[PDB]
Design a protein around this ligand. Structure first.
Ligand SMILES: O=C(O)c1ccc(C(F)(F)F)cc1
Length: 544
């Protein structure tokens, strides 16, 4: 079928959509842009085509292996009270006369409605359910992306999603997929897995496979296979009924309706703004790739999967032979409706492989021992930091990034230094800030950062010193390209920040002592002092 059919109704905005950036961080402001519904049609073209699927015994075997592990899972129904408490405080309100604030408080109005929606789910398993469609505002650096299309149902339905399925998507994918399940590893844990599975091959080869508009390539068949998997779990008969109804009424497809309530069309592939999306894309990406591997006779594969992001490390057969089997792999994925973006390519250096927009690099700790940490090209982080210091937003990529990439040269000298400069300058150190980790929203106290970092990265994250040339180039170029003060200017800024912090005692002096010990010259002796990196929730409207 066609992934999407369109009525002609525009995909419409909610309020003003700033495309441009209104400075000590970055000079070239005309390189930072934000996507708008103005880019919607261009995206619409990219994301709509017919889908021709052809399976094979490799698909059917993997799926059978998958359903057998899924059968050892037992999942429970979530109470209204529990489902409500998971909803973010600024989650889009209901078109039925209540908001997320009402939900969280267990207002009897929201809750009675949620009940009514669950009752309807149990009685009617056919009638398509209504979704809103929207162009996302995401910031990028120039060199030019169309807005991505977020699709999601009403708040009432979402609390029901949570009820029927939150426990299943928190638990199942780990069991089905074991060590390939990306979202069980914190970044340190993900480096360890990548580094160890690389060391464990005689003669290693690795490729990342970027799939062309994944959400579009997910067929209605795919989303039913996905249900059949969820159903293998041991379940309440009421949860099974709800799960059947939600996939048939919502996950498979339904009507698109814009901000002004006009009919925009109809969708027959993955919706980005539902609870099953991460789990679904992960199970569906793991199934197809695992099969493509077998088709292409790849030797002794370990895979890592986070939604639609794929990395395979395997045993090389030779540079010719590798290049070749990769083309078979690609043909296999295409048959499975998971065609390629940039075509994939063998690497023989872990450092050059990029997965989850990120890669492994090494540097050295206090005593001189070699140490592997996760990193990434810092362009989107700086961009968004630039953006986020300019216009106020209640999202803070900067803080999530400081957490994910704490050991990195850039997060320490640029992000840490900058925002701590602002937090001190505005006396806003004690304030909780909300940030995204694997699509879930956590409320974090910036002053806690030292412990947080100690527990996810160890003390060496406060003392890492000889970063690799290739990484130092990436960073310094990124800074020239974006017009950001070179690294020597931050060292001097960071000495100021560190000192002001040190004077305030308590957790503020501990931030200063630990976060900025890289910047002193004579270093202090740095001694010691979560359900976070468990599962992927992007799109699923989750708050802990
Ligand atoms: O899903 C994500 O947004 C995400 C995935 C992976 C990573 C990391 F690089 F640490 F592996 C970070 C964020």
């Amino acid at each position: 079928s066609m992934s999407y059919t369109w009525t002609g109704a525009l995909i419409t905005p909610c309020a003003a959509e700033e495309s441009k950036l209104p400075n000590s961080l970055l000079r070239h402001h005309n390189m930072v842009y934000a996507t708008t519904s103005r880019s919607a049609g261009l995206r619409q073209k990219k994301v709509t085509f017919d889908r021709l699927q052809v399976l094979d015994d490799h698909y059917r075997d993997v799926l059978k292996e998958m359903k057998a592990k899924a059968s050892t899972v037992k999942a429970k129904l979530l109470s209204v009270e529990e489902a409500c408490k998971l909803t973010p405080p600024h989650s889009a309100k209901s078109k039925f006369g209540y908001g997320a604030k009402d939900v969280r408080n267990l207002s009897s109005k929201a809750v009675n409605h949620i009940h009514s929606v669950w009752k309807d789910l149990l009685e009617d398993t056919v009638t398509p359910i209504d979704t809103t469609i929207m162009a996302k505002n995401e910031v990028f650096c120039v060199q030019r992306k169309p807005a991505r299309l977020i699709v999601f149902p009403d708040l009432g339905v979402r609390v029901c999603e949570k009820m029927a399925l939150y426990d299943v998507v928190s638990t199942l994918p780990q069991v089905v997929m074991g060590s390939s399940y990306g979202f069980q590893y914190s970044p340190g844990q993900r480096v360890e897995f990548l580094v160890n599975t690389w060391k464990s091959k005689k003669n290693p080869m690795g490729f990342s496979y970027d799939t062309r508009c994944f959400d579009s390539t997910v067929t209605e068949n795919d989303i039913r296979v996905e249900e059949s998997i969820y159903q293998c779990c041991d379940l309440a008969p009421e949860a099974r009924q709800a799960i059947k109804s939600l996939t048939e009424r919502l996950y498979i497809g339904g009507p698109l309706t814009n901000s002004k309530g006009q009919n925009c069309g109809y969708r027959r592939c993955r919706a980005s703004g539902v609870l099953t999306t991460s789990c679904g894309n992960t199970l569906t990406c793991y199934l197809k790739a695992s099969a493509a591997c077998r088709a292409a006779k790849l030797q002794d594969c370990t895979m890592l999967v986070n939604g639609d992001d794929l990395v395979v490390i395997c045993e090389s057969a030779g540079t010719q032979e590798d290049a070749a089997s990769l083309r078979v792999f690609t043909e296999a994925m295409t048959r499975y409706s998971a065609p390629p973006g940039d075509p994939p390519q063998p690497e023989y250096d872990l450092e050059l492989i990029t997965s989850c927009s990120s890669n492994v690099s090494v540097a050295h700790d206090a005593s001189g021992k070699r140490v592997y940490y996760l990193t990434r090209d810092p362009t989107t982080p700086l961009a968004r930091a630039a953006w986020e210091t300019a216009r106020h937003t209640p999202v803070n990529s900067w803080l999530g990034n400081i957490i994910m990439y704490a050991p990195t040269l850039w997060a320490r000298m640029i992000l840490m230094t900058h925002f701590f400069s602002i937090l001190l300058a505005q006396e806003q150190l004690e304030k909780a800030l909300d940030c995204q980790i694997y699509g879930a929203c956590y409320s974090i106290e910036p002053l806690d950062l030292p412990q947080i970092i100690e527990r996810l990265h160890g003390l060496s994250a406060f003392s890492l010193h000889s970063y690799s040339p290739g990484e130092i180039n990436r960073v310094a170029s990124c800074l020239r390209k974006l017009g950001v003060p070179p690294l020597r200017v931050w060292r001097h800024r960071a000495r100021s920040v560190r000192a002001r912090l040190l004077s305030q005692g308590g957790r503020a002096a501990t931030c200063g002592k630990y976060l900025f010990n890289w910047a002193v010259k004579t270093k202090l002796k740095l001694t010691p002092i979560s359900g976070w990196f468990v599962a992927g929730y992007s799109g699923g409207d989750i708050y802990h």
